[PDB]
Enzyme design. Sequence first.
Site, PDB file in Angstrom:
ATOM      1  N   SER A 111       0.786  -1.246   0.000  1.00 21.46           N
ATOM      2  CA  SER A 111       0.000   0.000   0.000  1.00 21.46           C
ATOM      3  C   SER A 111       0.821   1.302   0.000  1.00 21.46           C
ATOM      4  CB  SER A 111      -0.995   0.012   1.172  1.00 21.46           C
ATOM      5  OG  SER A 111      -0.371   0.326   2.398  1.00 21.46           O
ATOM      6  N   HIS A 164       1.601   6.268   4.615  1.00 22.47           N
ATOM      7  CA  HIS A 164       1.015   6.374   3.281  1.00 22.47           C
ATOM      8  C   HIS A 164       1.311   7.724   2.653  1.00 22.47           C
ATOM      9  CE1 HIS A 164      -2.125   2.947   3.982  1.00 22.47           C
ATOM     10  NE2 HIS A 164      -1.009   2.492   3.443  1.00 22.47           N
TER      11      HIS A 164
END
Length: 182
Positions: A111, A164
């Site tokens: 991710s 992220h």
Amino acid sequence: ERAGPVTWVMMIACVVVFIAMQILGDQEVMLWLAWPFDPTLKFEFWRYFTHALMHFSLMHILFNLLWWWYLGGAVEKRLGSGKLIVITLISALLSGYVQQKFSGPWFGGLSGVVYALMGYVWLRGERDPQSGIYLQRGLIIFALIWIVAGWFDLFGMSMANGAHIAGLAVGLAMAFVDSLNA
Ligand SMILES: CCCCCCCCCO[C@@H]1O[C@H](CO)[C@@H](O)[C@H](O)[C@H]1O
Ligand SMILES: CCCCCCCCCO[C@@H]1O[C@H](CO)[C@@H](O)[C@H](O)[C@H]1O
Ligand SMILES: CCCCCCCCCO[C@@H]1O[C@H](CO)[C@@H](O)[C@H](O)[C@H]1O
Ligand SMILES: CCCCCCCCCO[C@@H]1O[C@H](CO)[C@@H](O)[C@H](O)[C@H]1O
Ligand SMILES: CCCCCCCCCO[C@@H]1O[C@H](CO)[C@@H](O)[C@H](O)[C@H]1O
Ligand SMILES: CCCCCCCCCO[C@@H]1O[C@H](CO)[C@@H](O)[C@H](O)[C@H]1O
Ligand SMILES: CCCCCCCCCO[C@@H]1O[C@H](CO)[C@@H](O)[C@H](O)[C@H]1O
């Protein structure tokens, strides 16, 4: 049109690792692939990257790989394997580092690399259209939904928002640099 070697080996590696986890259990696999969790492991360099190979749920790996297949594929086809390799190596390291720093060494997934890829593909298409790479308009929407899912913890993705963002920063940076040459 078939996905290139880098795109392909990553996916298969992730599936092979995922299987090892179903069999041996998440714990065992993490013992070997997780970001160094103890001083005794600080010089086992593969750990600085192998954490990106582990997934903890069907939905986790399913979406990570769909995104990696679409974006990673596009980048590799249009910009070459080397380009994908660097984006992957750098984002994996940066995001892992940020993740580790704030939440400990127990995590995994592609991710962070996906955020970098969404950043790079989208930004490059906006700044350097004819470069041939761009994030399809309709897919920008589902990309945002995938992002929101993780951000508000509606979908378990292992990594936290900070990690992220670090991933995204890498892709945006490289895209900025790349649409800076010409
Ligand atoms: C962000 C995705 C990054 C994936 C990078 C995976 C790299 C795996 C490197 O492993 C290395 O392979 C050697 C083969 O012999 C071993 O000897 C060595 O001990 C081991 O460390
Ligand atoms: C620590 C970051 C470095 C990334 C590690 C990349 C490991 C690549 C291992 O893959 C193997 O590479 C061989 C190269 O010749 C191929 O012949 C073989 O088919 C392929 O399976
Ligand atoms: C809705 C969120 C998930 C979106 C996933 C989109 C997947 C699109 C996959 O396309 C495939 O990409 C490969 C690499 O580019 C090409 O080789 C191949 O021909 C093409 O069919
Ligand atoms: C972030 C990096 C993630 C891992 C990238 C691994 C790429 C491995 C590429 O393998 C290569 O595939 C070719 C086609 O099969 C072989 O001819 C060649 O011998 C082999 O070296
Ligand atoms: C659970 C969410 C699943 C979403 C499924 C979306 C299917 C439509 C995606 O189309 C894809 O669009 C890419 C960009 O144009 C093409 O490159 C690719 O070839 C094509 O397959
Ligand atoms: C990774 C998420 C990136 C930010 C998403 C931006 C949504 C706001 C609209 O932006 C841009 O507006 C253009 C004009 O309407 C579109 O043609 C283009 O496709 C779109 O990108
Ligand atoms: C260029 C590299 C990009 C790195 C991005 C780092 C962003 C990390 C965000 O930090 C987060 O901020 C929250 C509020 O301050 C804290 O509550 C939380 O604990 C912390 O994790």
